[PDB]
Symmetry: C3
Subunit: 338 residues, 3 copies
């Protein structure tokens, strides 16, 4: 019945994003994606704590899918027989059937194909949602990602001027609820099923043990810092499927920010810190003006520094002393100061 | 002194709303409302947990009051002699005297009549506020509701186009703090006064035991699902008097959302999840495009699934396979897949 | 190299703000500020609880700095040798070097001079950020304040109309994490260093023991209520360096609110409650219409009433019975009521 060109997309692992056009003169296509569920033990902090994760495509977050308004998105979801649980997928970008969850429940050893029309522009969360208490558990176990539906003319500033990014990164933030024993040590389990009862107890108190970007504390620091150059306009897509976050680029700003994540709304300009509602994605554009290290954090600094929620950007270029300079280096306080 | 027509309104129990006009060519009226305080033990979850509630008109939330900009709202507040505590009322829509709380403190066996002018458009919280620590306690015991002050021309999209709703529902969300004994069982009390000290201890740790719509887990599910039809524009008013919420219609969107709740501001369009600041009301308009069950949640899914914060809509009509379709039902993974 | 007029500003203690012009026809200046770090034990609640605070200029929050777009801000930061820790400063208003933190780390007995260009308008947080876990600890110990960068034409309503305030107050909100002993009593320490390990344990559970304005419960109540008059337009700048807040003026409104705090964005109008993202400052303008006491709160009323987060305004003038009146004082319920 639906007679449009089909285009297969190969997803990549976050924080990177598969190749795509911003502005396009192509008409609507059927864009074909495949997601494979993988349950696996994963390391989530710098002390080697593990937890029984559940993922789309082996990553937390799941990969970013990018399409244009008016495209049809055909998703094959696969639940390999090595998995232990049923899984499904709910797209916040889609209309009907609980975002697709009501049409996509699959047992281990099965797959399903859903098609949804990309009628609403923005960045949107997708996540597993098998039913009842399984919904939060699968989501906080890692089964969430995002999709971006671009306008066919690309981004704009809401005042008739085009915006183009030079680079795009997807930062998925994950709240984790890892059980502890009587002494406070984190517990380990042999399967997700075995972890469930103790994990649900931690979840009920609504306080995460870890808050991480790209699936672990320190994931996007050190050698996995995000690269940019002075003068580049960088789009940072940020998602949180379950809990609020307050992104902040330390030493920078959000030049254009869609904090509710929807491109039919004009962006706010010149933000210090923005707000991603739990259950949503948002996006910020920034043009780097200064080289050096930048930390990208949630600006609950306890979470950022102590629970794992810090990424770095390493930005190459020349320092602009007009914007900022050290006028006098650290020196002894003058004895004749009052 | 004030010589305007008087009109008596009969309130109804949430989630329904008393009859009202959207656009009106009537001039300013004195709109007369009565609220009666009722302290009573209420069931708040599906396991039969009870708590010592304090309510306006016997419901959590209190009823939605609807008037138009420029009306005068005359509220008789009654505190029957069967109650044990003093109560009052503070309208966020009103100007002066702590929103009216400073003029409305009544002991059991008394009543009071306050009049306030509806000078500001939007949806607004009202709540009890007797003074000091009694303020949070009365509010989290259930003494809060909302009022909607419509523009006389009805809603608009902020770009000169009228918006009209076919149906309106009021979803009041309540954070509850129910004490537990040493084993974790919820405690019961014979009066609000007796519950106070233990409840205040739970409140101080800022983590609710329950988060409910319309006064109990499951209130708006099953046979009390909210009804709609494909093609109907539905206004959902959401209030939270004490704690933030992040509403999400699973399988739908917010077509037009006033998340800060004030109709002098243009709505945002096409939201996945919106944000109700604690101490405020907001409103979202959505036109249903697909039949079936929709869950309306706060998108902290722990709260939604495990603490009680899920409502359902049951939507009648014909499925649109253009928007979404199951291309292939669950099937065994092809043996010749890689 | 930089050849502009220099102007020394003398800071004052919050909630007051140093003298400044709103609209200015002066060109860019080098505005010179000095901040001195002071570590000291401070009283933070009405029962006399103390904690080991770390402050800019001996106050929580640090003082508000006010400049205009295009000015250069030259800050001398001094860390006296009576202090025990290294400190620095990060300006959310500045571009590069982690907002200045990377250029300003000073040991006790040292000072440093940083210059940053005020290229972005709004109110912005500044805070200490020495590195790693020291970042949240210094911030929640009190080392944070705000800066306001005004447009050279002053504020506007985003629709081409000037806004002018008659009075300005800076309300800094501080989340504190005070350790308790086994019985629940707050612990005291002889130095910040000694308090660290126990404080970090409380911080990890993300629930504050106190939430205060101007450094202590009750700071801005009683005789330190904030003064205004009927008819005055008052700007309230609110900052929170670490945790979300939801400001509300009880009995009033936000006439014009920049909740993300940035004057390049038009304000929202007629708000009941607004939202300050942790890591940001926001600002609300209100014209008082009624005399009397107003409470300014975060509208988590538990925090407001029980954890310390209430300020008062005392507003002089004549009552307007058109806006609000008590039609009938408290009276016995009529025996012939149903
Ligand atoms: O012996 C505990 C010690 O070993 C580490 C090493 O990285 O990890 C083990 O213990 C953790 C807590 O049970 C587990 O999460 C992990 O799976 C296991 O290898 C340390 O993290 C831990 O303190
Ligand atoms: O708005 C984008 C997109 O949403 C649709 C429904 O799929 O329209 C919705 O929003 C419209 C614009 O706000 C409303 O007028 C309409 O009633 C609502 O269904 C699409 O038609 C539109 O392209
Ligand atoms: O947090 C309580 C308590 O537990 C201990 C081990 O008994 O540390 C655990 O908690 C720390 C904070 O989350 C982790 O850094 C560590 O991996 C974990 O074992 C104590 O060290 C701590 O007091
Ligand atoms: O890219 C930052 C990196 O460059 C160096 C010199 O190679 O210094 C530049 O950046 C400093 C601020 O971070 C400026 O103060 C300095 O003048 C400028 O040359 C390194 O110091 C710095 O880490
Ligand atoms: O015996 C406890 C058991 O009975 C239930 C039945 O619905 O409710 C009782 O106990 C609760 C906890 O004290 C009370 O809240 C309630 O008022 C009382 O009827 C169960 O909820 C409970 O587990
Ligand atoms: O804005 C609606 C309504 O509020 C009032 C006061 O009751 O005006 C306030 O807001 C005006 C528009 O923003 C301000 O210009 C005014 O100064 C402020 O008091 C009403 O007059 C107005 O209808
Ligand atoms: O939550 C702690 C602990 O308490 C028990 C009974 O001892 O269950 C209580 O808590 C549950 C979660 O809130 C409720 O579902 C139940 O109504 C309540 O009695 C244990 O079952 C649980 O481990
Ligand atoms: O109203 C939803 C209800 O209708 C049924 C058939 O009566 O199916 C419709 O909705 C499905 C998606 O929820 C579509 O896939 C199907 O093709 C459509 O006919 C029921 O299955 C469904 O629960
Ligand atoms: O003896 C405890 C009692 O004294 C008070 C008096 O104001 O304060 C003391 O104890 C507190 C808890 O250790 C300290 O924070 C404070 O520094 C010390 O003077 C009361 O607050 C306290 O209950
Ligand atoms: O926007 C205020 C201020 O920011 C600067 C950079 O210091 O410009 C940023 O924002 C501009 C307007 O949104 C962008 O076009 C620009 O690319 C970005 O660097 C200043 O130039 C401007 O005055
Ligand atoms: O909060 C637990 C418990 O501790 C006690 C003293 O043992 O009070 C402490 O906590 C109160 C709440 O924060 C404070 O008001 C007081 O300053 C502090 O000592 C008990 O009174 C209370 O049950
Ligand atoms: O400024 C408030 C203060 O004024 C008094 C009389 O001096 O009353 C005025 O304010 C009341 C509402 O708070 C009005 O109902 C009253 O009519 C008006 O005169 C005091 O009662 C009040 O505290
Ligand atoms: O389907 N989940 O356990
Ligand atoms: O300025 N960043 O914490
Ligand atoms: O007036 N309340 O307890
Ligand atoms: O998509 N709702 O959780
Ligand atoms: O530098 N701070 O401990
Ligand atoms: O209306 N203030 O809580
Ligand atoms: Cu799953
Ligand atoms: Cu969802
Ligand atoms: Cu009450
Ligand atoms: Cu209130
Ligand atoms: Cu410091
Ligand atoms: Cu910061």
């Amino acid at each position: 019945d639906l007679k449009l060109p089909r285009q297969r997309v190969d997803l990549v692992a976050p924080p990177f994003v598969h190749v795509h056009e911003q502005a396009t003169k192509q008409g609507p296509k059927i864009m074909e994606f495949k997601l494979v569920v993988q349950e696996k033990k994963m390391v989530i902090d710098e002390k080697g704590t593990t937890f029984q994760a559940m993922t789309f495509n082996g990553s937390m977050p799941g990969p970013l899918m990018v399409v244009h308004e008016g495209d049809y998105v055909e998703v094959t979801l696969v639940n390999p027989a090595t998995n232990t649980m049923p899984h499904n997928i709910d797209f916040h970008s889609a209309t009907g059937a609980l975002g697709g969850g009501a049409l996509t429940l699959i047992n281990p050893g099965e797959q399903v194909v859903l098609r949804w029309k990309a009628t609403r522009t923005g960045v949107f969360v997708y996540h597993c949602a098998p039913g009842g208490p399984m919904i939060p558990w699968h989501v906080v176990s890692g089964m969430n990602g995002a999709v971006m539906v671009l306008p066919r003319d690309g981004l704009n500033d809401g005042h008739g001027h085009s915006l183009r990014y030079d680079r795009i990164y997807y930062i998925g933030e994950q709240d984790l609820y890892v059980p502890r024993d009587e002494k406070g040590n984190f517990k380990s389990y042999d399967s997700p099923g075995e972890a469930y009862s103790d994990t649900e107890e931690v979840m009920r108190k609504l306080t995460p043990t870890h808050v991480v970007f790209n699936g672990k504390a320190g994931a996007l620091t050190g050698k996995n810092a995000l690269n940019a150059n002075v003068g580049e306009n960088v789009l940072i897509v940020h998602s949180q499927a379950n809990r609020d976050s307050r992104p902040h680029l330390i030493g920078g700003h959000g030049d254009y920010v869609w904090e509710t994540g929807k491109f039919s709304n004009a962006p706010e300009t010149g933000l210090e810190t923005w707000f991603i509602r739990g259950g949503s994605a948002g996006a910020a554009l920034y043009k780097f003006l200064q080289p050096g290290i930048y930390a990208y954090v949630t600006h609950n600094l306890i979470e950022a520094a102590n629970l794992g929620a810090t990424a770095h950007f390493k930005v190459e270029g020349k320092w602009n002393d007009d914007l900022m300079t050290q006028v006098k280096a650290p020196a002894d306080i003058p004895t004749g100061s009052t």
